[PDB]
Design a protein around this ligand. Structure first.
Ligand SMILES: Nc1ncnc2c1ncn2[C@@H]1O[C@H](COP(=O)(O)OP(=O)(O)O)[C@@H](O)[C@H]1O
Ligand SMILES: Nc1ncnc2c1ncn2[C@@H]1O[C@H](COP(=O)(O)OP(=O)(O)O)[C@@H](O)[C@H]1O
Lengths: 732, 58, 58
């Protein structure tokens, strides 16, 4: 009930806040009562609570001045509690902000403070920043001293004086600039994990104490540079009330030996004093590198003293340490031993949506053109790091400046304000920056011609189960992961595998049989294990085994020198496929020219259960193949694909592709000679003609003989007879 | 699994890594039954072709 | 040097032969060299461009 959402004010001044009447009844708050408001970064403010009929129950109406006071924005969560025993002020000291009084030479008291506090009984607190209208410009003040402290009421007899050194602008700017974890984007999973590891132990030490578990001593964050590790740490610290203390590694090593020890000891003592506290050590590898890889005892004693203090954490004062490193391995393992920096967090490259959020947050201060879109920039920037994205934005801004150099006068000492405000960064600047800045198979099924039965078999086998996992769970049958293709060479078996992998949008790894053989004792099986492990890492993936007949043979039928090595390779393949049986996502496809010598254990169900025969394409498939081949070729309409297909009934698809490439090349040569002849006669050929087609046809030859087809059909018939059973019918 | 790969009848060929395949079998023989106290270690082998396995293993 | 640069603004800092003063800390064999490199990094970070000082290193 105390927690309330920050909402815009209607008529609220810097000294009043508004709550709904039912919430007042729930919180037992009376109108005119003074309350204590708590915000982010241990910011406190006091105001008078008033009733508004249009205020939401879960929201509190709050103006910009108090929002700056509590370092919270619209939509944030703040806590409101009664503030009793607030006495009348005796003497209050307020000092102006430098940028608010530049050129203001009048009496600050009479002009601003006296009308503001006149008969209003405004509650104030030390450190409060309040803006008062008056004179020729509004002026902000900071409450630096109060009596009593920190809460007092500005009474008619309260002494208000503003003499003294004005508060520096830079000190005030630093607090205002820093905000919560809304700065970071795309790491809300990592942000939630860091919240769970950090803020919960800090807020509730007793929760860990009762069970008997010890809260984490340290947290370590690693990742590529520019991932906002220090940014995310400071941001997650800002949301929580826990104090954030920052330690800089170059600062520590810049100090002389021993003095840095005192500095870090004092840092830890101050953190223990300001419980709850968060210790962040930026660039931990800098202060404490690997102990063995050192040329000096100074860094060694740094690491040793750091270990002593890490063991010296109270864990009843509810303070923990975090650090960010570019390379975790550079950190000495002693710092990473159990009980010190035990919980280990990885920060990767931000995602596309996270990168879009990073662009939007970066460009919020930017004046941005309407035409430019950040979404397409995020899509193009697939791997750029958030720091690289900021550099991209800066480069685009400088490109906009370069575009606007002509309109402005660089020689002039003062630039025109009209051109400056009319300046905006367009899509062209972003494109120029993208050009300057630096950080699945391609075969689609339309490429393949025919094999529609093999098509539907491939979709049902591979594409279908991922589409409906619930249906498979209902049926309870795991999907098969093995397909074997056997047929004459050049029939698109590799094309079919690429097509299925492209359709399912998964990684594709293709390995050749003889590529893995090697000549050493254990190397072949090591290569097989390596490719299977690579398929594991790239899961989901499709593994294609070309020329499976070479890598897999009948184990019994080999009495040569290499028979033992071949048998060992087959056994390794069998064991690796048994291992693959665990992983559903990994798919294995095998292609062989001749399947007669394939080991029967390979053909066992569970490894390569699905056997699909790829025959020589028929007439319609051949027409489709020719059309796909000339999809990229401007072929004349006089050329008829129907006759070119029907003539070569026995030619394979590879021959068709070679013929099409040859015809395209001959069209190229005809265009070349026509253009050269035109140039010569000065001092054509839009499409390929039929003549080049027929004079290219004669060089082509039948790739596959009839005997290979006879053998393949005999093997298929042997499998057809194996199926048998006719139509199986249960009794009755 | 596939015990036939590492266990063979010995003296199969001279090109098996310069006798390394024969030498691995001899090391397996001592580990399974040698001059050491037998702990509670149970060895299970799943072979597909058992006739090629070394008779000393069986 | 950095104090004089920030005191009089705008100011320009040129570091000739930067590789001499600030090589890779792993390459360095001396504590003083590491301290100099760390001090240079600290003075890079401490500048906040309010005085708009620019440093070139050749
Ligand atoms: N989540 C994020 N959102 C927006 N900007 C980010 C984010 N993470 C990093 N950056 C950018 O990275 C820069 C800081 O890099 P940082 O990762 O904090 O340094 P280091 O990698 O040395 O710890 C900032 O200018 C900021 O714009
Ligand atoms: N169905 C098809 N559609 C289009 N081109 C094909 C087809 N079948 C074979 N080809 C052509 O044959 C050439 C070689 O095919 P290849 O992948 O070697 O087949 P295989 O898997 O039988 O070895 C490829 O360049 C391809 O253009």
């Amino acid at each position: 009930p105390n927690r309330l959402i920050v909402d815009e004010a209607i008529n609220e001044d810097n000294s009043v806040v508004s709550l709904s009447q039912p919430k007042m009844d729930e919180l037992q708050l009376f109108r005119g009562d003074t309350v204590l408001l708590k915000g982010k970064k241990r910011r406190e403010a006091v105001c008078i609570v008033l009733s508004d009929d249009t205020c939401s129950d879960e929201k509190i109406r709050m103006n910009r001045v108090v929002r700056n006071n509590l370092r919270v924005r619209l939509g944030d969560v703040i806590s409101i509690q009664p503030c009793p025993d607030v006495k009348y002020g005796k003497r209050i000291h307020v000092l102006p902000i430098d940028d608010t009084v530049e050129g203001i030479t009048g009496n600050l008291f009479e002009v601003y403070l006296k009308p503001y506090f006149l008969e209003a009984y405004r509650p104030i607190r030390k450190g409060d920043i309040f803006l008062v209208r008056g004179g020729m410009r509004a002026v902000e003040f900071k409450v630096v001293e109060t009596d009593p402290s920190p809460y007092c009421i500005v009474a008619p007899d309260t002494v208000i004086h503003c003499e003294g050194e004005p508060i520096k602008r830079e000190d005030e700017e630093e607090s205002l600039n820093e905000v919560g974890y809304d700065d970071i984007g795309g790491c809300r999973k990592q942000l939630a994990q860091i919240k769970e590891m950090v803020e919960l132990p800090l807020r509730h030490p007793a929760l860990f104490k009762e069970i008997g578990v010890k809260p984490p001593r340290g947290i370590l964050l690693y990742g590529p540079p520019g991932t906002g590790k220090t940014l995310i740490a400071r941001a997650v610290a800002n949301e929580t009330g826990a104090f954030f203390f920052l330690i800089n590694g170059p600062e520590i090593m810049s100090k002389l030996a021993g003095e840095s020890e005192s500095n870090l000891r004092k840092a830890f003592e101050e953190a223990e004093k300001n419980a709850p506290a968060i210790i962040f050590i930026d660039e931990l590898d800098a202060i404490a590198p690997k102990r063995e890889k050192t040329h000096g005892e100074v860094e060694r004693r740094i690491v040793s003293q750091l270990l002593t203090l890490m063991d010296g954490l109270k864990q009843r004062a509810h303070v923990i340490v975090m650090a960010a490193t570019n390379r975790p391995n550079s950190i000495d393992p002693a710092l990473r031993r159990f009980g010190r920096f035990d919980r280990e967090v990885d920060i990767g490259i931000p995602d596309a949506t996270g990168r879009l959020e990073i662009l939007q947050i970066h460009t919020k201060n930017m004046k941005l053109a309407d035409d430019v879109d950040l979404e397409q920039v995020a899509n193009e920037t697939h791997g750029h790091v958030g720091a690289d994205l900021a550099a991209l934005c800066s480069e685009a801004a400088l490109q906009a400046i370069r575009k606007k150099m002509d309109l402005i006068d660089l020689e002039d000492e003062t630039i025109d304000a009209e051109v400056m405000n009319s300046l905006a960064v367009t899509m062209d600047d972003f494109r120029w920056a993208l050009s300057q800045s630096n950080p699945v198979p391609q075969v689609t099924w339309e490429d393949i011609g025919g094999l529609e039965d093999v098509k539907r078999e491939l979709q049902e086998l591979v594409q279908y189960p991922v589409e409906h996992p619930d249906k498979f769970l209902k049926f309870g049958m795991t999907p098969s992961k093995g397909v074997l293709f056997y047929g004459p060479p050049g029939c698109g078996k590799t094309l079919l595998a690429k097509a299925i992998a492209n359709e399912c949008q998964a990684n594709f790894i293709s390995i050749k049989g003889p590529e893995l053989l090697t000549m050493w004792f254990g190397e072949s099986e090591a290569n097989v294990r390596e490719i299977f492990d690579k398929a594991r890492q790239a899961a989901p993936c499709v593994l294609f085994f070309d020329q499976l007949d070479s890598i897999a043979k009948a184990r019994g039928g080999n009495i040569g020198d290499g028979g033992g090595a071949a048998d060992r390779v087959i056994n390794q393949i069998l064991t690796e496929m048994d291992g693959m049986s665990t992983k559903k996502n990994v798919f294995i496809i095998g292609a062989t020219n001749r399947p007669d010598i394939i080991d029967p254990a390979i053909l066992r169900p569970g490894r390569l259960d699905q056997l699909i025969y790829i025959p020589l394409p028929d007439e319609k498939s051949r027409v489709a193949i020719l059309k796909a081949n000339l999809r990229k070729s401007p072929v004349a309409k006089d050329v008829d694909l129907e006759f070119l297909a029907k003539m070569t009934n026995g030619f394979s698809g590879a021959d068709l592709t070679e013929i099409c490439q040859r015809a395209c090349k001959l069209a190229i040569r005809e265009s070349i000679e026509s253009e050269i002849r035109r140039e010569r006669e000065r001092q054509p050929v839009p499409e390929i003609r039929r003549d080049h087609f027929e004079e290219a046809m004669r060089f082509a030859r039948r790739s596959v003989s009839d005997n290979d087809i006879r053998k393949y059909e005999m093997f298929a018939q042997t499998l057809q007879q194996s199926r048998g059973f006719g139509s199986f019918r249960f009794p009755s």
